[PDB]
Write a protein that binds this ligand. Structure first.
Ligand SMILES: CC(C)(COP(=O)(O)OP(=O)(O)OC[C@H]1O[C@@H](n2cnc3c(N)ncnc32)[C@H](O)[C@@H]1OP(=O)(O)O)[C@@H](O)C(=O)NCCC(=O)NCCS
Ligand SMILES: CC(C)(COP(=O)(O)OP(=O)(O)OC[C@H]1O[C@@H](n2cnc3c(N)ncnc32)[C@H](O)[C@@H]1OP(=O)(O)O)[C@@H](O)C(=O)NCCC(=O)NCCS
Ligand SMILES: CC(C)(COP(=O)(O)OP(=O)(O)OC[C@H]1O[C@@H](n2cnc3c(N)ncnc32)[C@H](O)[C@@H]1OP(=O)(O)O)[C@@H](O)C(=O)NCCC(=O)NCCS
Ligand SMILES: CC(C)(COP(=O)(O)OP(=O)(O)OC[C@H]1O[C@@H](n2cnc3c(N)ncnc32)[C@H](O)[C@@H]1OP(=O)(O)O)[C@@H](O)C(=O)NCCC(=O)NCCS
Ligand SMILES: CC(C)(COP(=O)(O)OP(=O)(O)OC[C@H]1O[C@@H](n2cnc3c(N)ncnc32)[C@H](O)[C@@H]1OP(=O)(O)O)[C@@H](O)C(=O)NCCC(=O)NCCS
Ligand SMILES: CC(C)(COP(=O)(O)OP(=O)(O)OC[C@H]1O[C@@H](n2cnc3c(N)ncnc32)[C@H](O)[C@@H]1OP(=O)(O)O)[C@@H](O)C(=O)NCCC(=O)NCCS
Ligand SMILES: CC(C)(COP(=O)(O)OP(=O)(O)OC[C@H]1O[C@@H](n2cnc3c(N)ncnc32)[C@H](O)[C@@H]1OP(=O)(O)O)[C@@H](O)C(=O)NCCC(=O)NCCS
Ligand SMILES: CC(C)(COP(=O)(O)OP(=O)(O)OC[C@H]1O[C@@H](n2cnc3c(N)ncnc32)[C@H](O)[C@@H]1OP(=O)(O)O)[C@@H](O)C(=O)NCCC(=O)NCCS
Ligand SMILES: CC(C)(COP(=O)(O)OP(=O)(O)OC[C@H]1O[C@@H](n2cnc3c(N)ncnc32)[C@H](O)[C@@H]1OP(=O)(O)O)[C@@H](O)C(=O)NCCC(=O)NCCS
Ligand SMILES: CC(C)(COP(=O)(O)OP(=O)(O)OC[C@H]1O[C@@H](n2cnc3c(N)ncnc32)[C@H](O)[C@@H]1OP(=O)(O)O)[C@@H](O)C(=O)NCCC(=O)NCCS
Ligand SMILES: CC(C)(COP(=O)(O)OP(=O)(O)OC[C@H]1O[C@@H](n2cnc3c(N)ncnc32)[C@H](O)[C@@H]1OP(=O)(O)O)[C@@H](O)C(=O)NCCC(=O)NCCS
Ligand SMILES: CC(C)(COP(=O)(O)OP(=O)(O)OC[C@H]1O[C@@H](n2cnc3c(N)ncnc32)[C@H](O)[C@@H]1OP(=O)(O)O)[C@@H](O)C(=O)NCCC(=O)NCCS
Ligand SMILES: Cc1cc2nc3c(=O)[nH]c(=O)nc-3n(C[C@H](O)[C@H](O)[C@H](O)COP(=O)(O)O)c2cc1C
Ligand SMILES: Cc1cc2nc3c(=O)[nH]c(=O)nc-3n(C[C@H](O)[C@H](O)[C@H](O)COP(=O)(O)O)c2cc1C
Ligand SMILES: [Cl-]
Ligand SMILES: [Cl-]
Lengths: 70, 70, 70, 70, 70, 70, 70, 70, 70, 70, 70, 70
């Protein structure tokens, strides 16, 4: 949008219950400090296995947010 | 399968509730007009953020379907 | 970790209900024969369509597990 | 947006004057037959050379447009 | 070429005898409905195995063809 | 250069007139807050279409800048 | 298919006569020890040159086969 | 074309005014020593920043040219 | 780990003596300002040549660190 | 092999009869001017279509050859 | 080489002292159980950070080894 | 820099002692015939294994050097 610069910061979102909740936990955490959060893009789905089970879903994400002027 | 040509058309499927339902909404929509839908392949998971929440899951997909003869 | 070699074997996990359960079914199956399962990485989400519905979610995965000494 | 399916069709746009005009010529041509054109994504910049000059800029593009119901 | 838009549609071509014949079967099938077929690009070689033999070569392809005016 | 750490932050630059001006708008905006801006790398060209025209060029970019000591 | 895990093992198939025969030699060799061989995917075509001729076609392949229960 | 070998040499073209002129400067320079220049392909767009401005556009390119017989 | 968000910031580490020391110089520099540094991932190895020698090893890196609550 | 530098030059090999013969025509042509040709790697398979048939197979290739001392 | 099948198994090699020693530790470990080890290919360099230092270099690797007949 | 064309030639550098020395051996060899060598970029790390040891490190590299006028 009109001469807007967008910052695309990278995070890994995490949850013991799935891919989707891992993305929601990062979006939630990101919205506490960041404004004008517009789009995400999944970069990777990974995760920790413990006792032959998935202990944490780790979803990498790019968060696009609109830059406020300096 | 025996001299079958397959067409691989690209779509983005969408849902307010998750990645999986976004893929089901596109498969559903695709099956209304297309026949011999055989396989999908996820090309990207993206999505819109509004008010620091995920408003829509946008899952890119290739849909492989068997071409009927001309 | 200290001079540990890790083996990264590739599998496709499958489920009729979603991406997440497809990853859990492979992790479960892998843990029956393999020890020291540490991390997974999703390589692809694909799937079979039958009657314009998703019949199986097929999630490709790398499974990292720690190699026991020979 | 709310349960919208998007179709992502691929084209190469062309112009004797540059990359940007090549993208505008395809968007123009695409808008003559297609409705609800929303976003493009550049897939490749290529081009023909003739007499040691660039004769045509060929910009590959994905065009995302919203699917009307069937 | 001069302000020509090109459409790049994706297909999988198939044959029981090899990669090359799989590409020829798709080009043949594509030429029955499509005009101004100019170039192809191989996107993937895959295939079905049955009884420890290759039953079908499946060669993915992009077909570039020149768009006639609307 | 001699034991310099460089930070590579990601932005999307935007303009209604083209790819180049979209990169200049981000470089300009980045230089208002950042010092020792050294190189950029284009990660993607995308853009919004409105009324069958390109409304904004969106050029993704990595900005390499030299880190001042902490 | 219904909660089946698939193992995707990687091999390079080889032949002095071509790409296709190199894939057939690996599929043949793989079927001597492995059961439920379902699909292959070409990862790379490489090869040795000797005396300005191609001495061996080396085709990389992923072999997907269905895992029997443990 | 009929048993023609093509050589694909890689260059970075440069200009203080944009992406397009950077590609034209390389094509020009390449045509002074090379014959049968047929196609280019952009491999990357990068560039130097000086005083918070873009000092040079650096466009990577593959140049395809037809090989004359030895 | 349990609902932890991880930030994945990108840097280029530099050294006149090698790839490894270039990664150590960035990790060192990063640890002066950042806490809960957990993993790195090499994105690229590049470098400057001066007088036909390698003057600096430039190793790109993603640094994963655990986000403290806001 | 012991402190040998290898040069990896890129070519497109061409044939009206297939992928394999296209690779043989380039290897043949390359061996007329180049010595110590060791390995090739296929970078892409493309081709021209004329009258709904494949007129030329165009196989991209990297040719690795051992550098003689200067 | 003459109708040889090669198996390409994936491992992560580890060392507290660098990238190279991490590759040597995996090659060593692999040679204790595997015969006809021919080539490796680095797939990734990653690593653990502890107390703002690199605790382990983790180098991913493909190991190509020649398959003995079944 | 001001209307400079840069040539990006590809080589594999080799050493029995490591990745770094393999890059230094190629840079050294390249500087005997080439002038204005400016930057390298690692394209891959591979290597030969003999007797369960690494016999040669093979580091692929792009060498960017400034083109002198024709
Ligand atoms: C929020 C944000 C976009 C603001 O960007 P900005 O407009 O450049 O503003 P900043 O406040 O970062 O200003 C630049 C700062 O870096 C400093 N700086 C500038 N150039 C520098 C250099 N070469 N080396 C070191 N520091 C430098 C400035 O002095 C200033 O610091 P100061 O406030 O201590 O003086 C940016 O801080 C950011 O991208 N944050 C990431 C947030 C994130 O990813 N959160 C994840 C939540 S899940
Ligand atoms: C269904 C489909 C496979 C049929 O393919 P097909 O066998 O080639 O049949 P088509 O009906 O497209 O025939 C080609 C048409 O394009 C025209 N055509 C052929 N060459 C052309 C060219 N160079 N320029 C312009 N038009 C051309 C033909 O004249 C014909 O149009 P007409 O019916 O108006 O005469 C194809 O239409 C398709 O791929 N659709 C995409 C569906 C999709 O992705 N849906 C998403 C749902 S989620
Ligand atoms: C478990 C595992 C890591 C053990 O690795 P290892 O330490 O090398 O031990 P192995 O038992 O495989 O030993 C090597 C075997 O291959 C043989 N071998 C060695 N080199 C060989 C060659 N060039 N050609 C053929 N066979 C060879 C050895 O003789 C031995 O076989 P044997 O027991 O019949 O004598 C390995 O078997 C593995 O990676 N398995 C994959 C498991 C998997 O992916 N499961 C999926 C569950 S979802
Ligand atoms: C516009 C578009 C999205 C409409 O998609 P849709 O909702 O699926 O509707 P369509 O009419 O295309 O598809 C149904 C048609 O395909 C046919 N079809 C369905 N399944 C089929 C199969 N397996 N094999 C062959 N044909 C099939 C149907 O019979 C029907 O043909 P008909 O119209 O002759 O009855 C689709 O045509 C499209 O993607 N077009 C591409 C536009 C483009 O790229 N333009 C470029 C401008 S620069
Ligand atoms: C041939 C082709 C290029 C023609 O493209 P075109 O110039 O855009 O012409 P179309 O006939 O597709 O026109 C657009 C159609 O989609 C409709 N349409 C346009 N925008 C739409 C939207 N947002 N949602 C749904 N439908 C839409 C139009 O109403 C029109 O349908 P109609 O014929 O029922 O009126 C296109 O049909 C195509 O790409 N086909 C694929 C062919 C193929 O892959 N064949 C495989 C052979 S192996
Ligand atoms: C400028 C920049 C390089 C400075 O980096 P730096 O040397 O690490 O300095 P910072 O000021 O970021 O210091 C780290 C801060 O994060 C905090 N921090 C450190 N580790 C942390 C963790 N694990 N969790 C949460 N916060 C943490 C520190 O407490 C400090 O915050 P404070 O200022 O409230 O004390 C950095 O701010 C940056 O990369 N900014 C992005 C600029 C940008 O992209 N601008 C876009 C312009 S278009
Ligand atoms: C066939 C195959 C799928 C069977 O997988 P599986 O169900 O996991 O069963 P396996 O017997 O291989 O794995 C268990 C073995 O690994 C061992 N193992 C388990 N975890 C381990 C670890 N962390 N470290 C070392 N060894 C381990 C077990 O002790 C057992 O060894 P044993 O048989 O000596 O008791 C698997 O062997 C495989 O992937 N083979 C590759 C086949 C191939 O690539 N063929 C090429 C032909 S061209
Ligand atoms: C133009 C070109 C295709 C000619 O290719 P060719 O038909 O192989 O002809 P060449 O003249 O290169 O012949 C091979 C040369 O390398 C030598 N050579 C062959 N094998 C060799 C080896 N293994 N080690 C070292 N030298 C070798 C030959 O002896 C001969 O050199 P000579 O002329 O000193 O005897 C080639 O020079 C080229 O690709 N140049 C790049 C042009 C370029 O990128 N320009 C940039 C403009 S912006
Ligand atoms: C440390 C870090 C994770 C903290 O993230 P955080 O929890 O989001 O907290 P921050 O303080 O950075 O972000 C909020 C700031 O950005 C601002 N901000 C939020 N949304 C914004 C927007 N849309 N536009 C501009 N600024 C915005 C806030 O106003 C606040 O600025 P303030 O501190 O001046 O009030 C983050 O600063 C970071 O990623 N730093 C990079 C460190 C790095 O790369 N170091 C390299 C060492 S080698
Ligand atoms: C064969 C080859 C490896 C020889 O490499 P080499 O050892 O560097 O030897 P060269 O003869 O190229 O020596 C460098 C030449 O470039 C010149 N040169 C060096 N640096 C330069 C610069 N920065 N700008 C312009 N020219 C430069 C030298 O002056 C010399 O030219 P000259 O012989 O006119 O004096 C090289 O010519 C090559 O890679 N050719 C490609 C072959 C090919 O792809 N063939 C296709 C067959 S299908
Ligand atoms: C060594 C190796 C190449 C031998 O391959 P091979 O020639 O296929 O021989 P295998 O011994 O694996 O034979 C296949 C086994 O899997 C079984 N099998 C075959 N198809 C199967 C299927 N669909 N499901 C489950 N098991 C199957 C066979 O019954 C046989 O098991 P058995 O020994 O209990 O009878 C193979 O074991 C391998 O790739 N190992 C990995 C070694 C490795 O990565 N080591 C790391 C060192 S760092
Ligand atoms: C050094 C270099 C940049 C010079 O580039 P240049 O300015 O184009 O100069 P060249 O000398 O290559 O001139 C082009 C040559 O190819 C010939 N040529 C031009 N077009 C041609 C075509 N289509 N087919 C065949 N030959 C052609 C010219 O006739 C001339 O050869 P000649 O000297 O025998 O007359 C180029 O030789 C090069 O890139 N070399 C690679 C060096 C390298 O990789 N070294 C490795 C060191 S580790
Ligand atoms: C691998 C390959 C890629 C090509 N890519 C393009 C391209 O992107 N744009 C284009 O106009 N022509 C392309 N061509 C066609 C050539 O530009 C050229 O017109 C054709 O090879 C005939 O040239 P010749 O007469 O020199 O053989 C390509 C050809 C080959 C073999
Ligand atoms: C980077 C690299 C890649 C290679 N790839 C292959 C390959 O794909 N197939 C092959 O048979 N040999 C390959 N080789 C081995 C070479 O073909 C050759 O036999 C070896 O370098 C010895 O050659 P020399 O005696 O000319 O040094 C490769 C070597 C290197 C350094
Ligand atoms: Cl025609
Ligand atoms: Cl400055």
């Amino acid at each position: 949008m009109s001469n807007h610069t967008y910052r695309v910061t990278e995070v890994v979102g995490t949850s013991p219950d799935g891919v989707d909740q891992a993305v929601r936990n990062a979006v939630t955490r990101a919205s506490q400090t960041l404004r004008k959060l517009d789009w995400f893009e999944v970069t990777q789905v990974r995760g920790q296995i413990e006792d032959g089970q998935v202990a944490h879903w780790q979803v990498g994400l790019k968060l696009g947010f609109r830059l406020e002027e300096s």
